[PDB]
Amino acid sequence: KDIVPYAAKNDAEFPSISTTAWQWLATTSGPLTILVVAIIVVVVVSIVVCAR
Amino acid sequence: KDIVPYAAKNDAEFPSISTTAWQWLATTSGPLTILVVAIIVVVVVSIVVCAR
Amino acid sequence: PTQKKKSKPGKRMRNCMKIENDCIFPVMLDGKVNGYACLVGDKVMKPAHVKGTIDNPELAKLTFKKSSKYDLECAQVPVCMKSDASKFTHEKPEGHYNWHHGAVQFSNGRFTIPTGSGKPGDSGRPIFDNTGKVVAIVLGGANEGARTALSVVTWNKDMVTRITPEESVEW
Amino acid sequence: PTQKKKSKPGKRMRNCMKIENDCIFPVMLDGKVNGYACLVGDKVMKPAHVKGTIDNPELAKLTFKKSSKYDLECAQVPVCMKSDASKFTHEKPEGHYNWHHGAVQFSNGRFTIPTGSGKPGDSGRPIFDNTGKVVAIVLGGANEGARTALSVVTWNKDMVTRITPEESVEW
Amino acid sequence: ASLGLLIVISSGFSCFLCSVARTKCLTPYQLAPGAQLPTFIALLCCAKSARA
């Protein structure tokens, strides 16, 4: 919507495969960082009780 | 002008992008590197005080 | 044999003093003793049954930061509150057999006292020593054998945040 | 009257009643004792109660390199000063009782004395083990409620400088 | 879509973090007290930032 040419194929992302489409997609890391923090804290409590 | 020939486009450092230019520029790097170490030595001593 | 040194009274003329002196305070809610408060350790740990039952209102409001998972406080109170409570803990004496009951055995990972009271609002009372250090905070217990097994939250030099026997009543 | 180890001939020419030192000097300012100087160890740790009072103008200026964020001085003094200089401290005895007065028990990570000390003009006296090893120099204090938490600078085995409960103020 | 996604990363991070700070106090206390050691401080710095 600037405009800047991109491919019009392959995956459906609605300007398709684009540097912009990839840049919008990069939210994907956010859900992963918040998940690593939850795993550690749940396992670490159980481990403390056992530790002492 | 370096006086050794150097020619590189599209940006020129005035003696363009060359080994010699990179080498001279390396000065800037020095405070920054030591700076990371400096902080750490300050911090560790503070951790002891805080601990009680 | 004899004692060949002293650094304290060599003799006595009667008994009229008590070896350790309580510092506890009962705590009211609807004018009923639903626990006991004291303000102990370095960082202050008490609430487990005096979360609801007020020490002083201001104090109640002030303290709370907690691990409500197991009901342990990691927030601390003023020096003002602290001097008036039992003495602080940083180690475990296990040589102690006096607080409010006639013997305190630590064996097989369990504190026991002989068959006692386990009546409402006896919860949250500290188990105080012969130098008044608090080794454990009573959450409840259950009578079996001829002893009473206790459920405790601890913090000395060794610590378990809420630990419970096989059988328990909520005291 | 035989004891385990005789430490008196049965006469008042050796005693078990010491409570003071002979390495102290009071340092005046306005005609008032606002500290004491002793020039402690060989790398001289003193000014934190005698930074604003000093001892003489000349020894201070010469010596003084510091870490003013914790107010501890580091720097050697000559042979003249060192001959009468207090004991070098680089280790920490546990449990103390003398300083000037009749308790400085070190437990729970706190020194406490009874209420009626922390007064200045009596502050600056080192906490001694009966060998003149200084774990801390008493700067002032704050009343807890029935005991007095003390303001200190320490340097012995470890720093941990200005061990206090949460905030005491020098006086 | 992308704009709404970013807000989800912040909401999840912040709420979890809070729970994480209470475990950070608990674990080194219970582990091996923990009342005068420098060890508490490393975990503690995170916990102070979380709660306030």
Swiss-Prot record, chain E:
Q: Covalent lipidation (S-palmitoyl cysteine) residues?
A: 15, 18, 25, 45-46
The topology of this chain with respect to the membrane is:
Single-pass type I membrane protein
| TM stretches of this protein | 1-17
PTM statement from Swiss-Prot or TrEMBL:
Palmitoylated via thioester bonds. These palmitoylations may induce disruption of the C-terminus transmembrane. This would result in the reorientation of E2 C-terminus from lumenal to cytoplasmic side.
Q: What are the subcellular locations of this protein?
A: Virion membrane; Host cell membrane
The source's domain of life comes to Viruses
Region (Interaction with the capsid protein), start-end ranges: 20-24
Which residues face the membrane's Cytoplasmic side?
Answer: 18-52
The disulfide bonds in this chain are 25-46
Q: How does it assemble?
A: Interacts with spike glycoprotein E1. Processing of the precursor of protein E3/E2 into E2 and E3 results in a heterodimer of the spike glycoproteins E2 and E1. Spike at virion surface are constituted of a trimer of E2-E1 heterodimers. Interacts with 6K protein. Interacts with host MXRA8; this interaction mediates virus entry. Interacts with the capsid protein.
Q: What does this protein do?
A: Plays a role in viral attachment to target host cell, by binding to the cell receptor MXRA8. Synthesized as a p62 precursor which is processed by furin at the cell membrane just before virion budding, giving rise to E2-E1 heterodimer. The p62-E1 heterodimer is stable, whereas E2-E1 is unstable and dissociate at low pH. p62 is processed at the last step, presumably to avoid E1 fusion activation before its final export to cell surface.
Q: What is this protein called?
A: Spike glycoprotein E2
Specify the species.
Answer: Barmah forest virus
